[PDB]
């Protein structure tokens, strides 16, 4: 039989998906198609905008971003960013959140952009005249961010190796007073990288510290003297 102590300990100890991602993408396609039908009926296309919170709250899950990208999220986002039958842009919220998500979804490979058409779908919004300036800036930076890899460029300055900088620095090398005067830092351009210039007491002190601790007039429950850190 279990002891009440072990029941308590086990009870407290007891406190410590690709299929649902696929189903989410299916629901995103259903929502965008229903909004196409509603737009043809000249009704408000609420389905995408009604699902948006649930979708955004899941695309942010760091542990699933690979699953999301590999499951065809880029295709669904392209469908949501695409203009409707009357060539109107999607709800402002959809553009704002999906563009922000795409910035936070950097693992996207070139083949993924080319196959999903998400690049076309964002370049479209970047060119589009009815797009707001903030969305145009997001689309612009997305287009730069996604095109740099095509040209092998990169924007992470911490990404260039040490030897690359040392080599580049060699590639770029050219051919009275009455009081103390504060000297100013050397402006010299350093090219060349310099070669490097290369207990019995604490046991007794710990023992004495332990004796000091042992001598204290401590109490089992720390009484709040002035009401600070009062429990519950």
């Amino acid at each position: 039989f279990l002891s009440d102590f072990e029941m308590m300990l086990q009870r407290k100890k007891s406190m410590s998906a690709d299929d649902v991602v696929s189903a989410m993408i299916v629901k995103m396609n259903e929502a965008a198609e229903e909004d196409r039908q509603l737009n043809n009926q000249k009704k408000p296309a609420l389905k995408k905008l009604t699902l948006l919170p649930a979708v955004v709250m899941h695309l942010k899950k760091q542990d699933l971003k690979e699953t999301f990208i590999d499951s065809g999220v880029m295709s669904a986002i392209k469908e949501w960013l695409s203009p409707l039958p009357d060539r109107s842009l999607p709800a402002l919220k959809i553009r704002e959140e999906l563009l922000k998500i795409l910035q936070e979804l950097p693992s996207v490979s070139q083949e993924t952009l080319k196959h999903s058409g998400i690049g076309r779908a964002v370049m479209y919004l970047y060119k589009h005249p009815k797009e707001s300036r903030s969305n145009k800036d997001m689309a612009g930076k997305l287009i730069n961010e996604w095109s740099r890899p095509i040209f092998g460029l990169t924007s992470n300055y911490k990404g260039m190796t040490r030897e690359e900088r040392e080599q580049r620095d060699l590639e770029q090398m050219p051919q009275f007073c009455a009081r103390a005067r504060v000297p100013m830092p050397s402006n010299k351009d350093y090219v060349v990288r310099p070669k490097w210039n290369v207990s019995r007491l604490d046991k007794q002190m710990r023992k004495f510290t332990d004796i000091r601790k042992k001598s204290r007039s401590a109490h089992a429950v720390k009484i709040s003297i002035e009401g600070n850190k009062m429990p519950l």
Binding site: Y157, K158, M160, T161, R162, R165, E166, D169, S186, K188, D189, Y190, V191, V192, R193, P194, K195, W196, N197, V198
Partner: protein
């Protein structure tokens, strides 16, 4: 007058406050590394040695090597 500096501008990539000093008081050696370009230098220290002394040894080695 004021408080002594503890973060420095990498004398190579000039990125500000990018270099930090690790002081191995046990092996008597200070290690400085640029958290941007990853450049490093190591110099013998003493108990009097402060981060500003390591950084200076780096600057003195650079100023001597770039001649």
């Amino acid at each position: 007058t004021g408080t002594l500096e503890t973060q420095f501008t990498c004398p190579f990539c000039n990125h500000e406050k990018s270099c930090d000093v690790k002081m191995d008081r046990a092996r008597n050696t200070g290690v400085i590394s640029c958290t941007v370009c990853l450049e490093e230098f190591q110099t013998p220290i003493t108990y009097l040695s402060e981060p500003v002394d390591v950084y200076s040894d780096w600057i003195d080695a650079c100023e001597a090597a770039n001649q």
